[PDB]
Amino acid sequence: MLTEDDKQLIQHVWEKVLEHQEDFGAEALERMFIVYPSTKTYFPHFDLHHDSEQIRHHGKKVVGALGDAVKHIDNLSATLSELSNLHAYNLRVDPVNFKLLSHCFQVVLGAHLGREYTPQVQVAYDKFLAAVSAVLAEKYR
Amino acid sequence: MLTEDDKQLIQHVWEKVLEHQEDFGAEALERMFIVYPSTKTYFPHFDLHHDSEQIRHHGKKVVGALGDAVKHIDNLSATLSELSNLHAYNLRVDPVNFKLLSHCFQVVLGAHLGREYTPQVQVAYDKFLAAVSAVLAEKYR
Amino acid sequence: HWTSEEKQYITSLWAKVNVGEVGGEALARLLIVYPWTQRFFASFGNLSSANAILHNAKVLAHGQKVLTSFGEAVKNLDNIKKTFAQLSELHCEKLHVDPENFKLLGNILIIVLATHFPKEFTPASQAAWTKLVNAVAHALAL
Amino acid sequence: HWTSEEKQYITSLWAKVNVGEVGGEALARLLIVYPWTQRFFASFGNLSSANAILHNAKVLAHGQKVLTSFGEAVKNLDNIKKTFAQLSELHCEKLHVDPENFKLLGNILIIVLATHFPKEFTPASQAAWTKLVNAVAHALAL
Numbered sequence A, B: 001m002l003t004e005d006d007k008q009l010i011q012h013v014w015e016k017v018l019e020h021q022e023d024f025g026a027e028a029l030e031r032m033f034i035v036y037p038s039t040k041t042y043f044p045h046f047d048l049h050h051d052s053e054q055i056r057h058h059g060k061k062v063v064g065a066l067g068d069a070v071k072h073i074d075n076l077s078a079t080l081s082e083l084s085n086l087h088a089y090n091l092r093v094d095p096v097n098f099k100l101l102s103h104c105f106q107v108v109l110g111a112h113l114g115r116e117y118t119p120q121v122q123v124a125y126d127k128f129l130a131a132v133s134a135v136l137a138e139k140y141r
Numbered sequence C, D: 001h002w003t004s005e006e007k008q009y010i011t012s013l014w015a016k017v018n019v020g021e022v023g024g025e026a027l028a029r030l031l032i033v034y035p036w037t038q039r040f041f042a043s044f045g046n047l048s049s050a051n052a053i054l055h056n057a058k059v060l061a062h063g064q065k066v067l068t069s070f071g072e073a074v075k076n077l078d079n080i081k082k083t084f085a086q087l088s089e090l091h092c093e094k095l096h097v098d099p100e101n102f103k104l105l106g107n108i109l110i111i112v113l114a115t116h117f118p119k120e121f122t123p124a125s126q127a128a129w130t131k132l133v134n135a136v137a138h139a140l141a142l
Ligand code: HEM
Pocket: A039, A042, A043, A058, A061, A062, A065, A066, A083, A087, A091, A093, A097, A098, A099, A101, A102, A132, A133, A136
């Protein structure tokens, strides 16, 4: 389970993310699209060129939802209920893809944090991102 | 989430399992060992020949725990807490293996139920076995 | 590679398989047990419920074709990689199906075979058939 | 296969890699983030905590050897399958490590490289390196 120490490590890193929600979100999305091109088929309506308005606007929305999750870590299901119905019932997102985006997010974090993205920090975010992923896919179970 | 209908479908099939806990448990374990030989390394102390006392005794214990889980489906974590600490802290069971055993259990069920192992029944057990697996591995998160 | 015994477990059981029935079963179960797979079948019409899926003519016909394809592996166990190369390009480049789903369909087929052939689907038989679906999943992920 | 550009993203970044530091990091992170992997290192002594793992000399030395092994893929990008055949037998038949863990170590290495080379580890670079660890994971799962 997420410990208090995990939460603190998460918050310390997150307040930085919040200062550039758009930049981080877009970078995580673009790494996913470039590294795992199959994920692009979920966004046919999007102009997927580097830094497109759609990607930037969406990146901020993703970061925004993750920020809300950080704020309500003990009440994820309820907090993401609307998003869970969306990704499962409407978008039919393959669970595997949540892991791909979570991973790309960690890469963005690692790149921006340098030596501050310690193993302890990675653990906390891994736990966090895995919990968020589980909720966004619970409608399949 | 597990619906009431899922629970009923599960119970109907399970009362049959309970009549031969040892037979079912052993069959599921042996299919795992034979189909996924790597899982055998977790049981070096066991005589792994077909129907060995150790396999039969263990099969019944596994079925027994699953039976308890069926009985307390709304309180899994607490009910399996002791088993979760065991599989994670003591045995270091790779999460992938819970999926292998869950799958072999479904094969045993399918074989014994025939046309009664409908898609609806499979869904219910898939949900159930996945939930039990998540709990037995939560200590890793 | 394949041992004569493994090849026998595969060819002998397959000769008894009702391709249309098992195929429809496997595909309907894929869409029902792992609902996100429905994403790839928007043109198949109503898939709004387990019952709707089991009565979907297109879903049934498609499963028949899928299991027929599996049959081509059974009939040429040593050239599976070459046999599915075309389908591999189709599911990846064209359909963009994550490879993990190939493994899930394989697992479903294993369970279906068990419900249809309880007497013959022994642990040893399961081992041979699991090796089969895995090889097909591998060839398709190519 | 590998495009000249991909090969450049790999060889140029690797020439700057501190194998011992990145290797120790990757292995310590594997044991910490996915604790069940500790099962395979009972002889390495104390691994009772994240700090214990990061200060474990054997864990660090081993990671060095692991990343050195990855280096052999970087140095011969077209014969990865052949280069790791020996290690494949070792991790499967001898160690019985589930293949899924090969993918997890690969992912960890990707993240480590990112924390060490933020400027050079662009999305395109990540794509090339992800292709690399995946190929090693594939060769080992052989
Ligand atoms: C870290 C896990 C994820 C979170 C927190 C998340 C969050 C969100 C949110 C909040 C929206 C709605 C934006 C709005 O209201 O405009 C959204 C939309 C969407 N998401 Fe995700 N998402 C995640 C993962 C994924 C994955 C893995 C995929 C598949 C590759 C995906 C595909 C989509 C699509 C197609 C939309 C529709 C957006 C549009 O049309 O603008 N998401 N997501």
